[PDB]
């Protein structure tokens, strides 16, 4: 398929491994997304200016 893009596909490895990597990487991966979330938070903190209100949400509800 295409220009040599993919040529690395048939690993041909039924193996519970790989599978079990990959669900390991989707905990991986939000994991590092729960924290960008808050370090969203904080960029977002930036822009506003004095966010005691926003951060402390939680007893602003």
Not at 15 to 32: A, D, G, L, P, S
Not at 39 to 44: A, D, G, P
Request: no cysteine; proline share 3%; hydrophobic share 40%.
């Amino acid at each position: 398929s295409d220009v040599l893009d993919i040529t690395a596909d048939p690993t041909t490895a039924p193996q519970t491994e790989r599978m079990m990597r990959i669900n390991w990487k989707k905990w991986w991966q939000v994991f590092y997304t729960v924290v960008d979330y808050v370090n969203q938070i904080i960029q977002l903190m930036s822009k506003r200016s004095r966010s005691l209100n926003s951060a402390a949400f939680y007893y602003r509800v």
